[PDB]
């Protein structure tokens, strides 16, 4: 049903949330903090098909 | 003591099993040092004019 198609398009194109490594509170002795992101969106036609 | 249903064992477990619950700052962004001694402070600004 159309609900299935809409739900699949919702879930596969998800917009994962950005985050950071080594954020406060932090362990003793942490010297490096780096932002990290994950791509979860469909890019072009091929993935959608 | 929050109850949580565990899939593998089939019996109820407690939140303490899968997490440590504490009371702490809502955000850990900022910190203060008054004379090298930890403390807390707030900055007062004045309206223009």
For B25, name the nearest residue in chain A, comparing CA atoms only.
Answer: A25
Q: Which chain A residues are within 8 Å of B28, Cβ to Cβ?
A: 24-25
**CA A38/CA A48 separation, integer angstroms:** 19
**Elucidated via:** cryo-EM
Interatomic CA distance for residues B49 and B6, integer angstroms:
62
For chains A and B, CB pairs below 8 A equal 3
Residue B29: Cβ-neighbour burial (10 angstroms; 0-12, 13-18, 19+) = exposed
Q: How far apart are CA A14 and CA A17, in angstroms?
A: 9
Instruction: For chain B, positions 12-31, list CB contacts with chain A under 8 A.
Output: 28-29
B11 in A contact zone (CB under 8 Å): no
Given a contact cutoff of 8 angstroms between Cβ atoms, the answer to whether A12 and A38 are in contact is no
């Amino acid at each position: 049903s159309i609900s299935d198609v809409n739900n699949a398009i919702r879930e596969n194109n998800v917009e994962i949330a950005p985050g950071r490594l080594g954020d406060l509170p932090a362990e003793k002795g942490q010297l490096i903090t780096i932002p990290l992101s994950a791509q979860g969106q469909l890019s072009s036609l091929e993935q959608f098909k | 003591n929050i109850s949580l249903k565990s899939k593998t064992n089939g019996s109820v477990i407690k939140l303490s099993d899968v997490a440590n619950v504490e009371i702490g700052s809502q955000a850990y962004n900022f910190a203060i040092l008054e004379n090298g001694k930890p403390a807390t402070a707030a900055a007062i600004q004045l309206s223009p004019g």
